[PDB]
Design a protein around this ligand. Structure first.
Ligand SMILES: CCCCCCCCCCCCCCCCCC(=O)OC[C@H](COP(=O)([O-])OCC(O)COP(=O)([O-])OC[C@@H](COC(=O)CCCCCCCCCCCCCCCCC)OC(=O)CCCCCCCCCCCCCCCCC)OC(=O)CCCCCCCCCCCCCCCCC
Ligand SMILES: CCCCCCCCCCCCCCCCCC(=O)OC[C@H](COP(=O)([O-])OCC[N+](C)(C)C)OC(=O)CCCCCCCCCCCCCCCCC
Ligand SMILES: CCCCCCCCCCCCCCCCCC(=O)OC[C@H](COP(=O)([O-])OCC[N+](C)(C)C)OC(=O)CCCCCCCCCCCCCCCCC
Ligand SMILES: CCCCCCCCCCCCCCCCCC(=O)OC[C@H](COP(=O)(O)OCCN)OC(=O)CCCCCCCCCCCCCCCCC
Ligand SMILES: CCCCCCCCCCCCCCCCCC(=O)OC[C@H](COP(=O)(O)OCCN)OC(=O)CCCCCCCCCCCCCCCCC
Ligand SMILES: CCCCCCCCCCCCCCCCCC(=O)OC[C@H](COP(=O)(O)OCCN)OC(=O)CCCCCCCCCCCCCCCCC
Ligand SMILES: CCCCCCCCCCCCCCCCCC(=O)OC[C@H](COP(=O)(O)OCCN)OC(=O)CCCCCCCCCCCCCCCCC
Ligand SMILES: CCCCCCCCCCCCCCCCCC(=O)OC[C@H](COP(=O)(O)OCCN)OC(=O)CCCCCCCCCCCCCCCCC
Ligand SMILES: CCCCCCCCCCCCCCCCCC(=O)OC[C@H](COP(=O)(O)OCCN)OC(=O)CCCCCCCCCCCCCCCCC
Ligand SMILES: CCCCCCCCCCCC(=O)OC[C@H](COP(=O)(O)OCC[N+](C)(C)C)OC(=O)CCCCCCCCCCC
Ligand SMILES: CCCCCCCCCCCC(=O)OC[C@H](COP(=O)(O)OCC[N+](C)(C)C)OC(=O)CCCCCCCCCCC
Ligand SMILES: Nc1nc2c(ncn2[C@H]2C[C@H](O)[C@@H](COP(=O)(O)OP(=O)(O)OP(=O)(O)O)O2)c(=O)[nH]1
Ligand SMILES: [Mg+2]
Lengths: 175, 99, 63, 320, 347, 120, 140, 98
C-alpha cells in the first residue's frame, strides 16, 4: 500500500547501506550509497522537506562522482570484488539483509519491536500534523533564516570551508 | 557553557536555536510549543535536581507530545480490537468510517 | 616562657582548631543535604531559561 | 632582529637577496692537487667568500676567540697519528673521520647561512658530499672496521638529506704518481708515509662513485693539473654555466626559510652526529667525558654564554 | 610551511576548542570538534614522511568515528527532549554514546590504541598539542554533562586507563610513547573524580598540562626523542637534567612537589563520598607511573651514561631554541603545594 | 558544586560583591611565597641559557618577581572571595533549615557512660 | 552482569549449592568470553578452528574457576554452619587459584593465584557484609 | 518513534559496524563515514520536519557542510597513503607500533 511508502523507502535505505557496508569494490559501494541517497531524499521529501531531500541527493551525487574518480586511481585492483566474489563480503551482505528481514517481519506482524528503543508499527502516517501552514513552506522559511538568524553559523561554516581549502593543499603538498 | 562569554558580552551566538518555543520566523509555532513552554517555566531557576521531581508532570506531557508513545499504544489497542471483532463477524463499521 | 603563656596560648590554639572542626563537619552535612534535595546554591545544575520563550501571537491559534 | 618567522613575514626572504652570482662552489680532488690555491683564487675573481678546508679545529675557529683549542677538547684526533699508525687500537682512524664529517657538516651549514643571509656566494674545499672518499679509502686498506662504515652511513643518511648540493663542482684530476711525487716534494714527514694504494682508493671513489653522483645534480667541471694552474680559465667556464639542473631550481621562499632556520641553529645541525650508537672508536666513558667537560668550561670566555664572560672584558652583565 | 599559514592553522585549532567552551548549543559543540580536527591534521603532516602520514590517518579515523557517535547522541537527545541545549542529556542511550565519543577523543582505555602511535609518528611540538590542548574541549563537555553520565561507565574507563597507562609505559624506550601512556593514565584521575567534584577534574587537568608542557619543552630543547638520546644531556646541559628530575618526580605524585596536589585532592573528594576502595586502588596503581619516571631519572640525571666523541663539538654552541615559558613552567610544576588552597579560584 | 550559585555574576574574575572583603595585605605570607617563586624562575632562566645566575640581567629578574606578585595578588583576592562565598551559603542554608541542624542536648562526662578498656 | 550477581546474592550462603554453582560458572564463563573476544580481535588466529579452539580454552578456564569457587565456597559454608564468614570465600578463592594452575601447567601460578584469589574472595565477602562500595554513588 | 525511525537507526548501526570492520581498502571505510553522515542527516531532518521546529531546519544543511570537509580531508589523506605505497591498503599503515 502507498500508505507505507515511507517505510518501503526506508527498507531500501537500509539495503543500500548493507550494499556499501559489506565493503565490495568502492565502485559498487559508491552505487549503494547513491541508492541510499536517492531513497533518503524520498523519505525526507515525504515529511515536508523538498529542499532538504533534493539537496542531500545533489550533494551526494557530486560526492560519489569524485569518489568514483579516486577509486579508479587509488582503490582499484585487477578483479574488483562484488557482493558474491568474496565470502567475507557475501557473509556480511547476507547477514545484513537477514537482520533487515527479521526487523521488518516482526514490526509488521506485532506492530511493535523493542531494540534499545521501543518502535511502533502502526505506520508513519499516524504522527503527521493535521493543520495546514499558510502561504509558505515552513522548511524553506527555516532554511532562509540562516542569513538573518544564523549570523554565527555562517561565519564558522564560512571559515571552515576556507580553512578546508588551505588544509587540503597543505596535506597533499608532499614537500 | 563552560565559559559564558555570551551572557557577559550580551551577544546571542547560539541561544536562539536551543529551544523550539523561542522566536521563530513568521511566528511559526512548533507542534509541542505549549508543552515545552510549560516545562521550561515550571523548571526555571530551581535547578535540575528539583525540576527532575517537581516538574515531572510537565516533562512527561512534553515527552508524550514529542514521541506520542502513549497515543500510538492507545490507537493500537483500538485498531487491534476492531480487527478481532470484524474477523469474527461481530462489528459493522459505519459508512463515514468506510466512505 | 612561663607556664601561664603556654597554658593560655594552647587555649587560643584549641579554640581555633575546635571551631574549624565544627565547620568541617557542618559543611559535609550541608553538602549532603543540598545534593540530595537540590534546594540550595550548591549543586544547582542549570535549567533552560524562561526568557528565551516567545509569548507573541503565533501563526496558528492553538499554541 | 634575530632571523625567524617574524623576520621572514616582514620581508627577509631569500629570493629577494639571491642573484645570478649567488652560487655555492666546491673544489674537489686528491691530496696535493692544487685545490687550495685554485679555490682561493676563484673566490677573489668572482667576489666570493672563501672557506679554508675544514680540519680538526674548524669549529674552534668560529667560536670563542677563534683560536684552536687544546687537542683534548677535540677527542685527541690527530691527522699526524693517522699517517704514522693507521691501524692503532685506540680507534684514532675512524674517530678522526667522524670528527671531520661533523666539521664539514658544520662548515657547510655556515656556508649556506652566509649564502642565504647576504646573497654572496661561497667557495668550499671537499664539502660533506665528497668526504666519503677518505672513508672508502680507509676501509679498503683495513684502517677502519666494517661497523665504523655502518656508523658513518647512518650519521650521513640523516644529515646530508637536509641540505642542498653545491651549484658547481670543480674537480682537479691528477694521476696518483703525480700526487705521490708532489707529496714527497712538499716534505711533510707524516704525509710522506701515505702509500700509493690509499691514494688510488681516493681516486676510484672520486671518479666512479662521486662525480657520477654529482653530475646529475650539479655543474661538474673537470680540469687537469696543467689546465688548473690558470684560475682565469676556470672562472670563465663558471661564468658561462647554464644551471639547468639540480634541486636549486625547485626552491622558493618557503623552502629556503626552512633551510635557513636549520643552518643557523648549530646544535640542530649537529644533532645527529652523536647518535646513541656505541662504537669503541667514538664511545667515551662517563668519567673521562665528565672531566674533560669541566676543563672546557674553565677556558677563558667559555664558562658562560658568549657576551657574559667578565674574565674576557664583557660588561653590562647585570643589564644584559 | 608558510609561517603565516602555520599561524592561521594554529589559531583555527584554538578557535575550534574555544567554540566548544562557549557554545550553549549542541550543534556548535560538534562544529568545534570538526573545526579542531580539520586544523590539527595539517600540523601532523608538516614534516611529510610515511610515519607522519600513518599517524594522521589513524588519528583522523578515530576522531571521525567519535564525532559520528557524538552527533548520534545529540540527535537522540533531540528526539527525547526537543531542545539542543548543552546540559545534561535526557536519554540513557544518548549519554553512553556521548560518553564513549568523549572517551575516544580523550584516548581513554579501551579506546587508547591510537594515542601511543599518533604521538610517536608526529614531531615533539605537534605531540605537545595532541596531549595538552586537545584535552580541553572533550573535558569541557564532560564537565557539563556529568550529572547524566552513567557512574559505572565513567569509573570503568577511569580504572582501565590507570591500569593500561601504567602497564604500557613500562615496556617503552621512546619518550613520545612514554609520554603517551602517561597521558592515558592521567586521564583516569580526571574522569574518576568527575562524578564527585568536577572542580578537581579542572585542577588535575591544569596541573597535568603544566607538567606535560614542561617535559616536552625540555625534550624539545635538546631534540631528544629516545631514552639514550636523553642520556647524553648531562654531558651538554647539566642544569636541564636537574629540571627533568624535579619534573619527573612531580609527575609521579611525590610530595612536596606540585604533582602530588591533584592526587591528594582527588582522594579527599572520593573519601568524602565514602569511596575508599577506589582511591586506594588508584593510588597504588599509580606507582606503575612513578616506576618508569624513576627509570628516566636514572638514565638522565642520577647516573652518567656513556658519551660519544662528537659531543665535544656541541659544547661550543648555546641553546638557540626558544624554550618559551620553561623557567616559569618548571617552577609551577615543582613548587606549588604551599599554594594548594588556591584551587578555589577554579570554582 | 558552586558553579550555578544564585549570584548572577557569571564569567567574572571578581564579582562586585567581592569588594566588601578585605584585600590581601601586600606583606601577606602567601604573596611573599608567590614572589619567591618568581625569583626562582629568574634564576632558572639564567641557568638554562648559561648566564651568571645571581647577577645576569637584573632587569629581567625584577620583571619575573613583579609579574608573579602582580598575578598572585589577584588570584589571592579571588581565592579569598570564593571561600567567603562558601561560608555565606553554608550559614544561610543552616539558617533556612533549622530542623536539619538542631542544637544537640548538652551532656557532661559525669552523666555520659563510656566503656572502659583495660590495657593489661 | 547485574542480573546474575543479584541472583547469586539472593541465594543465602551455604544453601542451594547447585544454583550458586550455576551463577558463578556463568560469571566466570562470561569473563572468559570477554577475554576471548579481545584476544581474537587483537591477536588474529591463523585459522577459524584455531580461534574457536582458543575461545574454548579461555572460556573453560574461566568457567572452571567460577564453578569451583561457588561449589567450594558453598559446601564449606554448609558444613561449618557459618554463612557470614569470609573464611568460606578464602577457601573458595584458593581452590579457583589452584584450577588456574592446573590449566596453565604451572605450580608457581597455582600458588600465587591461590593466595591472591583467596584474599580477593575474602575481601569481596567482607564488603558485602560491611556495605563497601566500589562504585559509590555521589553523596556530597 | 514510528517504524521509519527503526530503519534509519538501523542504517546508522550498519554503517557504524561497517566502519569498525575494515577489509583492505581505506576508500571502503571512507564510504562508511559518508554513509553514517547520511543516516544522521535523514534522522535529524525527519525529527525537525515532523516537530515543525522551523529554525532547526538549517541544522541538516550545516551537517552536510561539515560532512564534506571531513570527506575531503579523508580523501586528501588517502592520496598521500597511495603515493607512499601504491595502494590504499590499511595493512601498510603499521610502521607505528602501540
Ligand atoms: C597584565 C599582567 C601580566 C603580567 C605579566 C607581564 C609580563 C609578561 C610579558 C613579558 C614577556 O615578554 O614574556 C612573555 C613571553 C616570555 O617567554 P620567555 O621567552 O620564556 O621569557 C624568558 C625570556 O628569556 C625573556 O627574556 P628576553 O631577553 O627575551 O626579554 C626580556 C623580557 C623579560 O620578561 C620577563 O620577565 C619574562 C617573565 C615574565 C612572564 C612570567 C610569566 C607570567 C607571570 C604569571 C605566571 C605566574 C602565576 C603566579 C604564580 C602561580 C600562582 C600564584 O622583558 C620584556 O620583554 C619586556 C616586555 C614588556 C611588554 O614572551 C613571549 O614570547 C610571549 C609574548
Ligand atoms: C582561552 C580559554 C582556554 C584556555 C584555558 C583552559 C583552562 C580550562 C580549565 C580551567 C579554566 C579556568 C577555571 C575557571 C576560571 O577561573 O575562569 C573563569 C572565571 C570564573 O568564571 P565562573 O565562576 O563563572 O565559572 C566558569 C568556569 N567554570 C564553570 C569552569 C568554573 O571568570 C574569568 O576569569 C573570566 C573573566 C576574564 C575575562 C577576560
Ligand atoms: C586495593 C589494593 C590493591 C592492591 C593491588 C596489589 C597488586 C599486586 C598483585 C600482583 C600479583 C601478581 C602475582 C604473580 C604471580 C606469579 C607467579 C609465577 O609466575 O611464578 C613465580 C614463581 C615460579 O617461578 P619459577 O619456577 O620460574 O622460579 C622462580 C625463581 N626464579 C626467578 C629464579 C626463576 O613462583 C613463586 O615464587 C610464587 C610464590 C607464590 C606465593 C605467593 C604468596 C603471596 C602472598 C602475599 C605475600 C605474603 C605477605 C602478606 C601476608 C598477608 C597476610 C594477611
Ligand atoms: C551473527 C553475526 C555473524 C554472522 C556470521 C558472519 C560470518 C559469515 C561467514 C564469513 O564471513 O566468512 C568466514 C570467515 C572466513 O572468510 P574468508 O574471507 O574466506 O577467510 C579466508 C580468506 N582468505 O571466517 C570468519 O571470520 C567468521 C567469523 C564468525
Ligand atoms: C598556574 C597559575 C597560572 C596563572 C596564569 C595567569 C592567570 C591569572 C591572571 C590574573 C591576571 C589579573 C589581571 C588584573 C585583574 C584585572 O584588572 O581584571 C582583568 C579582567 C577583568 O576582570 P573582571 O572580573 O572580568 O571585571 C569585573 C568588573 N566588575 O579579569 C581577568 O582578565 C582575569 C584574568 C583571566 C582569567 C585567568 C584564569 C583565572 C583562573 C586561574 C587559573 C589558574 C588556577 C591556578 C590553580 C592552582 C592550584 C594551586
Ligand atoms: C558455561 C559457559 C558459560 C557461557 C557464558 C555465560 C553466558 C551467560 C552470561 C550472561 O549473563 O548473559 C549475557 C549474554 C546474554 O545476553 P543478555 O540479554 O544480557 O541475557 C541476560 C543475562 N543476564 O550472553 C553473553 O553474550 C555473555 C558472553 C559475552 C560475549 C562477549 C564476546 C564479544 C561479543 C562480540 C563478538 C566479536 C565481535 C562481533 C563482530 C565480529 C563478527 C561476528
Ligand atoms: C570476526 C572476529 C575477528 C576475525 O576476523 O577472526 C578471524 C579468525 C581467523 O580468520 P583468518 O582467516 O585467519 O583472517 C586472517 C586475516 N588476515 O577466525 C575467527 O573468527 C576465530 C574466532 C571465531 C569465533 C569463536 C567462536 C565463537
Ligand atoms: C558459549 C560457549 C562457547 C564455547 C566455546 C566454543 C566451543 C569450543 C569447541 C572446542 C574447541 C577446541 C578446544 O580446544 O576447546 C576444548 C576445551 C578445553 O580446551 P583444551 O582442548 O583442553 O586445550 C588445552 C588446555 N590447555 O573444552 C571446552 O570446554 C570447550 C567449551 C568451552 C565452554 C565450556 C563452558 C563450561
Ligand atoms: C573476573 C571478573 C569476574 C569476577 C568478579 C565478579 C565478582 C565480584 C563482583 C562484586 C560483587 C558485587 O557486584 O556486589 C556488590 C557487593 C554487595 O552486593 P549487594 O549485597 O547486592 O549490595 C546491596 C547491599 N545492601 O559488594 C562488594 O562487592 C564488595 C566490594 C569489595 C571489593 C574488594 C576488592 C579489593 C581489591 C580491589 C579490586 C577492585 C578495584 C579494582 C578496579 C575494579 C574495576 C571494576
Ligand atoms: C603569535 C604570538 C606572538 C609571540 C610568539 O611567540 O610568536 C612567535 C613568532 C616570533 O618568533 P621569531 O620570528 O623567532 O621572533 C621572536 C624571537 N626573536 C625576537 C628572538 C627573533 O611570532 C610570529 O610569528 C607572529 C607573526 C604575526 C603575524 C600574524 C599573521 C596574521 C594572522 C591572521 C589571523 C587570521
Ligand atoms: C568435583 C569437585 C572438585 C572439588 C575440588 C576442591 C578444590 C581442589 C582443587 C585442586 C586443583 C588441582 O588439581 O590442583 C593441582 C595443581 C598442580 O599444579 P599443576 O599446574 O596441575 O601442575 C602440573 C604439572 N605438570 C604440567 C608437569 C603435570 O595445584 C597447584 O598448582 C598447586 C601447587 C602449589 C601449591 C600451592 C599451595 C601453597 C600456596 C598457597 C599459600 C596461601
Ligand atoms: N683522514 C682524512 N685526512 C684528510 C681529510 N681532509 C684532509 N685530509 C688530510 C689529507 C692531507 O694529508 C691533508 C691536506 O689535504 P689537501 O687536500 O688539502 O692537500 P694539500 O693541502 O696538501 O694541497 P692542495 O690544497 O690540494 O693544493 O689533510 C679527511 O676528510 N680525512
Ligand atoms: Mg690544502
Amino acid at each position: 500500500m502507498m500508505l507505507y511508502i515511507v517505510f518501503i523507502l526506508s527498507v531500501i535505505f537500509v539495503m543500500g547501506f548493507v550494499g556499501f557496508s559489506s565493503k565490495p569494490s568502492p565502485i559498487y559501494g559508491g552505487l549503494g550509497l547513491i541508492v541510499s541517497g536517492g531513497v533518503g531524499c524520498g523519505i525526507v521529501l515525504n515529511f515536508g522537506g523538498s529542499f532538504l531531500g533534493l539537496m542531500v541527493f545533489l550533494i551526494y551525487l557530486g560526492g560519489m562522482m569524485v569518489v568514483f574518480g579516486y577509486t579508479t586511481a587509488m582503490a582499484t585492483e585487477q578483479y574488483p570484488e562484488i557482493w558474491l566474489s568474496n565470502k567475507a563480503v557475501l557473509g556480511a551482505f547476507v547477514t545484513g539483509l537477514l537482520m533487515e528481514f527479521f526487523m521488518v517481519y516482526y514490526v509488521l506482524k506485532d506492530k511493535e519491536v523493542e531494540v534499545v528503543f521501543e518502535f511502533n508499527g502502526l505506520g508513519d502516517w499516524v504522527i503527521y500534523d493535521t493543520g495546514d501552514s499558510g502561504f509558505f513552506s515552513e522548511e524553506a522559511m527555516g532554511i532562509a533564516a540562516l542569513y538573518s538568524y544564523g549570523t554565527w553559523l555562517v561565519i564558522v561554516t564560512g571559515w571552515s570551508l576556507l580553512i578546508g581549502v588551505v588544509v587540503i593543499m597543505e596535506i597533499t603538498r608532499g614537500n | 557553557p563552560f565559559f559564558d562569554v555570551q551572557k557577559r558580552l550580551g551577544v546571542d551566538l547560539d541561544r536562539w536555536m536551543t529551544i523550539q518555543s523561542a522566536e521563530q520566523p513568521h511566528k511559526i509555532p512548533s507542534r509541542c510549543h505549549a508543552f515545552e513552554k510549560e516545562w521550561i517555566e515550571c523548571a526555571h531557576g530551581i535547578g535540575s535536581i528539583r525540576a527532575e521531581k517537581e516538574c515531572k508532570i510537565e516533562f512527561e506531557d512534553f515527552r508524550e507530545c514529542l514521541l506520542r508513545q502513549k497515543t500510538m499504544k492507545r490507537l493500537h489497542a483500538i485498531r487491534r480490537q476492531r480487527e478481532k471483532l470484524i474477523k469474527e463477524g461481530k462489528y459493522t463499521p459505519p459508512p463515514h468510517h468506510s466512505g | 616562657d612561663g607556664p601561664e603563656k603556654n597554658y593560655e596560648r594552647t587555649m587560643a590554639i584549641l579554640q581555633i582548631e575546635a571551631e574549624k572542626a565544627e565547620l568541617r563537619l557542618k559543611e559535609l552535612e550541608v553538602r549532603r543535604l543540598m545534593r540530595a534535595r537540590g534546594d540550595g546554591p550548591w549543586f544547582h545544575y542549570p535549567t533552560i531559561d524562561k526568557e528565551l520563550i516567545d509569548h507573541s501571537p503565533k501563526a496558528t491559534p492553538d499554541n | 632582529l634575530q632571523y625567524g618567522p617574524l623576520a621572514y613575514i616582514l620581508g627577509e626572504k631569500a629570493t629577494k637577496k639571491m642573484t645570478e652570482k649567488s652560487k655555492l662552489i666546491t673544489v674537489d680532488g686528491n691530496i696535493c692537487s692544487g685545490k687550495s690555491k685554485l679555490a682561493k683564487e676563484i673566490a677573489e675573481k668572482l667576489g666570493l667568500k672563501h672557506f679554508p678546508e675544514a680540519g680538526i679545529h674548524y669549529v674552534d675557529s668560529t667560536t670563542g676567540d677563534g683560536k684552536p683549542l687544546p687537542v683534548q677538547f677535540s677527542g685527541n684526533c690527530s691527522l699526524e697519528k693517522f699517517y704514522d699508525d693507521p691501524k692503532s687500537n685506540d680507534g684514532n682512524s675512524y674517530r678522526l673521520q667522524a670528527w671531520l664529517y661533523a666539521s664539514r657538516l658544520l662548515q657547510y651549514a655556515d656556508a649556506l647561512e652566509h649564502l642565504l643571509s647576504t646573497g654572496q656566494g661561497v667557495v668550499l674545499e671537499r664539502s660533506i658530499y665528497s668526504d666519503f672518499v677518505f672513508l672508502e679509502a680507509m676501509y679498503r686498506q683495513g684502517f677502519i672496521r666494517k661497523q665504523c662504515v655502518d656508523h658513518y652511513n647512518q650519521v650521513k643518511k640523516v644529515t646530508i638529506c637536509e641540505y642542498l648540493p653545491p651549484h658547481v663542482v670543480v674537480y682537479v684530476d691528477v694521476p696518483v704518481p703525480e700526487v705521490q711525487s708532489r707529496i714527497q716534494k712538499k716534505g711533510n714527514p707524516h704525509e710522506m708515509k701515505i702509500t700509493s694504494a690509499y691514494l688510488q682508493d681516493i681516486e676510484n671513489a672520486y671518479k666512479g662513485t662521486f662525480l657520477p653522483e654529482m653530475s646529475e645534480k650539479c655543474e661538474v667541471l673537470q680540469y687537469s693539473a696543467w689546465e688548473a694552474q690558470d684560475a682565469e680559465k676556470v672562472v670563465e667556464d663558471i661564468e658561462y654555466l647554464k644551471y639547468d639542473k639540480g634541486p636549486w631550481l625547485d626552491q622558493n621562499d618557503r623552502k629556503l626559510h626552512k633551510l635557513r632556520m636549520l643552518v643557523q641553529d648549530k646544535l640542530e645541525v649537529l644533532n645527529y652526529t652523536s647518535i646513541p650508537v656505541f662504537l669503541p672508536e667514538v664511545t667515551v666513558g662517563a668519567h673521562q667525558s665528565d672531566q674533560v667537560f669541566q676543563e672546557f668550561t674553565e677556558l677563558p670566555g667559555r664558562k658562560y654564554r658568549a657576551g657574559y664572560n667578565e674574565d674576557v672584558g664583557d660588561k653590562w652583565i647585570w643589564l644584559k | 610551511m608558510n609561517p603565516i599559514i602555520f599561524i592561521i592553522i594554529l589559531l583555527t585549532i584554538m578557535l575550534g576548542t574555544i567554540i566548544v567552551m562557549i557554545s550553549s548549543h549542541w550543534l556548535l559543540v560538534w562544529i568545534g570538534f570538526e573545526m579542531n580536527m580539520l586544523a590539527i591534521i595539517p600540523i601532523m603532516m608538516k614534516n611529510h614522511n610515511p610515519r607522519a602520514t600513518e599517524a594522521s590517518t589513524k588519528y583522523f579515523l578515530t576522531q571521525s568515528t567519535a564525532s559520528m557517535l557524538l552527533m548520534m547522541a545529540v540527535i537522540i537527545n533531540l528526539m527525547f527532549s526537543g531542545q539542543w541545549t548543552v546540559m545534561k542529556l535526557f536519554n540513557p542511550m544518548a549519554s553512553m554514546l556521548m560518553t564513549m565519543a568523549l572517551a575516544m577523543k580523550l584516548g581513554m582505555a579501551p579506546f587508547h590504541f591510537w594515542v601511543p602511535e599518533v604521538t610517536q609518528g608526529i614531531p615533539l611540538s605537534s605531540g605537545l598539542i595532541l596531549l595538552t590542548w586537545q584535552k580541553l574541549a572533550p573535558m569541557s563537555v564532560l564537565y557539563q554533562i556529568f550529572p547524566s553520565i552513567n557512574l559505572n561507565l565513567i569509573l570503568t574507563l577511569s580504572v582501565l586507563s590507570i591500569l593500561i597507562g601504567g602497564w604500557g609505559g613500562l615496556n617503552q624506550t621512546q619518550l613520545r610513547k612514554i609520554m603517551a601512556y602517561s597521558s592515558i593514565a592521567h586521564m583516569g584521575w580526571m574522569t574518576a573524580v568527575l562524578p564527585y567534584n568536577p572542580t578537581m577534574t579542572l585542577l588535575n587537568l591544569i596541573i597535568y598540562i603544566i607538567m606535560t608542557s614542561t617535559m616536552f619543552t625540555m625534550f624539545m630543547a635538546n631534540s631528544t626523542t629516545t631514552t639514550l638520546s636523553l642520556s647524553h644531556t648531562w654531558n651538554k646541559t647539566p642544569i636541564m637534567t636537574v629540571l627533568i628530575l624535579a619534573t619527573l618526580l612531580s609527575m609521579g605524585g611525590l610530595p612536596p612537589l606540585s604533582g602530588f596536589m591533584p592526587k591528594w585532592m582527588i582522594i579527599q573528594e572520593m573519601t568524602k563520598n565514602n569511596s575508599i576502595i577506589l582511591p586506594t586502588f588508584m593510588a597504588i596503581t599509580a606507582l606503575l607511573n612513578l616506576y618508569f619516571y624513576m627509570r628516566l631519572t636514572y638514565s638522565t640525571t642520577l647516573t652518567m651514561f656513556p658519551s660519544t666523541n662528537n659531543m665535544k663539538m656541541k659544547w661550543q654552541f648555546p641553546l638557540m631554541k626558544k624554550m618559551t615559558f620553561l623557567p616559569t613552567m618548571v617552577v609551577l610544576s615543582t613548587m606549588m603545594l604551599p599554594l594548594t588552597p588556591m584551587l578555589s579560584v577554579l570554582e | 558544586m558552586m558553579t550555578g550559585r544564585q549570584g548572577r555574576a557569571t564569567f567574572q574574575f571578581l564579582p562586585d560583591e567581592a569588594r566588601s572583603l578585605p584585600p590581601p595585605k601586600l606583606t601577606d605570607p602567601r604573596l611573599a611565597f608567590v614572589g619567591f617563586l618568581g625569583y626562582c624562575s629568574g634564576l632558572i632562566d639564567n641557568a638554562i641559557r648559561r648566564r651568571p645566575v645571581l647577577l645576569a640581567g637584573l632587569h629581567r629578574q625584577l620583571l619575573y618577581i613583579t609579574s608573579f606578585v602582580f598575578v598572585g595578588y589577584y588570584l589571592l583576592k579571588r581565592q579569598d572571595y570564593m571561600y567567603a562565598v562558601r561560608d555565606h551559603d553554608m550559614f544561610s542554608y543552616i539558617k533556612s533549615h533549622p530542623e536539619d541542624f538542631p542544637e544537640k542536648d548538652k551532656k557532661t562526662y559525669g552523666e555520659v557512660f563510656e566503656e572502659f578498656h583495660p590495657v593489661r | 552482569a547485574k542480573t546474575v550477581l543479584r541472583q547469586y546474592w539472593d541465594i543465602p550462603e551455604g544453601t542451594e549449592c547447585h544454583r550458586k554453582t550455576y551463577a558463578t560458572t556463568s560469571i566466570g564463563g562470561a569473563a572468559g568470553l570477554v577475554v576471548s573476544a579481545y584476544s581474537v580481535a587483537l591477536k588474529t588466529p591463523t585459522s577459524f578452528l584455531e580461534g574457536v579452539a582458543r575461545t574454548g580454552r579461555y572460556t573453560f578456564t574461566a568457567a572452571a574457576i567460577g564453578a569451583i569457587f561457588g561449589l567450594t565456597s558453598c559446601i564449606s559454608a554448609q558444613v561449618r554452619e557459618k554463612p557470614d564468614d569470609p573464611l568460606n570465600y578464602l577457601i573458595g578463592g584458593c581452590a579457583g587459584g589452584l584450577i588456574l594452575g592446573a590449566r596453565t601447567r604451572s605450580y608457581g601460578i597455582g600458588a600465587a593465584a591461590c593466595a591472591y584469589m583467596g584474599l580477593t574472595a575474602a575481601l569481596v565477602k567482607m564488603g558485602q557484609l560491611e556495605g563497601w562500595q566500589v562504585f559509590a554513588e555521589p553523596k556530597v | 518513534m514510528s517504524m521509519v525511525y527503526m530503519n534509519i537507526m538501523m542504517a546508522f548501526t550498519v554503517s557504524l559496524v561497517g566502519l569498525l570492520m575494515y577489509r583492505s581498502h581505506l576508500m571502503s571505510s571512507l564510504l562508511c563515514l559518508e554513509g553514517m553522515m547520511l543516516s544522521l542527516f535523514v534522522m535529524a531532518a525527519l525529527t525537525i520536519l515532523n516537530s515543525h521546529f522551523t529554525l532547526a531546519s538549517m541544522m541538516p544543511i550545516i551537517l552536510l557542510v561539515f560532512a564534506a570537509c571531513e570527506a575531503a580531508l579523508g580523501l586528501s589523506l588517502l592520496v598521500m597513503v597511495s603515493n607512499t605505497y601504491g595502494t590504499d591498503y590499511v595493512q601498510n599503515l603499521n610502521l607505528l607500533q602501540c
